[PDB]
Design a protein around this ligand. Structure first.
Ligand SMILES: [Zn+2]
Ligand SMILES: [Zn+2]
Length: 259
């Protein structure tokens, strides 16, 4: 379950499908009018994502948008490759757009330097907080969730199975992690951003959460249970609250370690 590891793709709920790697989430939200891909995984993982979209019976050329949670190599390293394969437009929080275009994080990023540069992508544009991205029957909403990066976005939509519609959340990372030489204690606005993001996420309508690092909402455990339980195994409306709580606990642990 490395960041670039192969992983057999699977439907999560209705037209929401997991197409990421064994260690990093990527989601295809499908429709007869075109698809939306959320995240690219790593540069090496793009080959996995591409293989998985096809394994699910979809054409890469039908992907019209690629949504980015945040501009770290583990989530966005494969976006350029996926962009070339699809012809899609890449959408991201305004403060992460330049990193997506160049592959180089700003010096203000907590993981500047400790995570690698990655390939720059063509066709990147900004979304605003609250912006609705529409594609045929699909409608994905952007929620600004900064802190782990400045331009982090958590993306939400609805998918339906057999007439039962659920609110799906692709949760950006809310973790106070960084280079060894970076101190959150020196960046009080980064900390305030993180705490704002915990509140935003715990308030989301959230039947099904897919965390950018999938184990954060027990993806692999849930997938194993889906075999006998069906896709209800992915449904847990306390999940956004739990991800937010874990971020809050980690931030407290982190600030304590810095003192
Ligand atoms: Zn990250
Ligand atoms: Zn990550």
């Amino acid at each position: 379950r490395d960041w670039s590891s192969p992983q057999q793709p699977f439907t999560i709920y209705g037209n929401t499908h997991y197409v990421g790697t064994g260690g990093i989430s990527a989601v295809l939200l499908s429709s007869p009018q075109g698809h939306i891909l959320v995240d690219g995984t790593t540069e090496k993982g793009a080959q996995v994502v591409a293989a998985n979209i096809r394994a699910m019976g979809f054409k890469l050329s039908d992907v019209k948008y690629i949504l980015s949670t945040h501009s770290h190599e583990d989530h966005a390293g494969g976006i350029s490759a996926m962009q070339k394969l699809t012809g899609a437009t890449v959408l991201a929080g305004a403060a992460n757009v330049d990193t997506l275009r160049t592959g180089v994080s700003p010096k203000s990023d907590p993981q500047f330097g400790s995570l690698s540069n990655f390939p720059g992508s063509a066709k990147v544009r900004a979304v605003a907080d609250g912006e609705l991205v529409k594609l045929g029957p699909l409608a994905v909403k952007a929620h600004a969730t900064p802190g782990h990066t400045e331009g982090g976005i958590t993306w939400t939509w609805q998918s339906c199975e057999q007439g039962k519609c659920k609110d799906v959340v692709f949760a950006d990372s809310l973790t106070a992690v960084s280079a060894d030489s970076y101190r959150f204690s020196d960046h009080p606005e980064v900390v305030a951003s993180l705490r704002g993001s915990f509140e935003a996420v715990e308030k989301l309508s959230c039947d099904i959460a897919i965390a950018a690092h999938p184990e954060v909402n027990d993806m692999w455990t849930r997938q194993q249970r889906a075999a006998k339980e069906g896709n209800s195994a992915y449904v847990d409306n306390g999940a956004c609250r739990a991800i937010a709580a874990a971020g809050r606990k980690r931030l407290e642990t982190r600030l304590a370690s810095e003192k």
